[PDB]
Ligand binder design. Structure first.
Ligand SMILES: CN1CCN(c2ccnc(C(=O)N3CCC[C@H](C(=O)Nc4cccc(-c5ccc6c(c5)C(=O)NC6)c4)C3)c2)CC1
Ligand SMILES: CN1CCN(c2ccnc(C(=O)N3CCC[C@H](C(=O)Nc4cccc(-c5ccc6c(c5)C(=O)NC6)c4)C3)c2)CC1
Lengths: 118, 120
């Protein structure tokens, strides 16, 4: 799974963030380089093998002035080599960059069976 | 004397971080109802509430920038401008200004103020 882009749990807070597996560190763990530059060891069970976050996934969308809310991925777009998510909330859609989309513990848990490593 | 109506820095249970808000109710036995400056509300134990507004000078804090970037820094100034509070935060010998909604405390940072500023 080394070099693959994933969505993984940051241990200290239960949230799942996009990043890449850089190394297999053994004991069921892998080194992760997160898209924000942070690094840590994550257990295979806490790594979802999906890039991009799939359509119809319930996510946490991050706005300006630290505001965040739940919504559903209804689109993917590529623009100048960057990924954007079209997130639906109360029948309307807004575009969010890859760095503005995360999963809560419960939202991530929902993808474990189909996308988890373990 | 009651702490109800006072502006504080309180722990949000789900992540260990401390945020500015106001105590709205004494819900008995050392717990209080909190209205946070972002509009969120919950019950917080007195021991997890810091009685300080503004966050004092020389406090180690977590400063929030744009595009979700955050870092540790030390409060070296307080400024009132157009009726609003700003914190001058020092990081590796340089200072930047942050609004009240861009300054929080981690679990360890808030724990350090419990003995001097905590309620319970
Ligand atoms: C008093 N109030 C206090 C606040 N409060 C919370 C209630 C529940 N949860 C929280 C919380 O705590 N969070 C949710 C909002 C986003 C927070 C985050 O996670 N910030 C961040 C900060 C820095 C970076 C990246 C980031 C992004 C996207 C990506 C990456 C990296 C990355 O590596 N790949 C993709 C995100 C977490 C607050 C309500 C009550
Ligand atoms: C892969 N990466 C993923 C990200 N990652 C983390 C490592 C440690 N911690 C976090 C984290 O999770 N947080 C830190 C950054 C701010 C996050 C927050 O707390 N966001 C927020 C969201 C919404 C509102 C208010 C807010 C503000 C100020 C105030 C109030 C309300 C308020 O009520 N009074 C004052 C803040 C929490 C990420 C590093 C590794």
């Amino acid at each position: 799974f080394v070099g693959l882009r994933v969505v993984a749990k940051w241990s200290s807070n239960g949230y799942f963030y996009s990043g890449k597996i850089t190394r297999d560190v053994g004991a069921g763990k892998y080194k992760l380089l997160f898209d924000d530059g942070y690094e840590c060891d994550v257990l295979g069970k806490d790594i979802l093998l999906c890039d991009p976050i799939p359509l119809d996934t319930e996510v946490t969308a991050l706005s300006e002035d630290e505001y965040f809310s739940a919504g559903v991925v209804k689109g993917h777009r590529k623009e100048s080599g960057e990924l954007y998510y079209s997130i639906e909330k109360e029948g309307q859609r807004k575009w969010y960059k890859r760095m503005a989309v995360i999963l809560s513990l419960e939202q991530g848990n929902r993808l474990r069976e189909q996308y988890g490593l373990g």
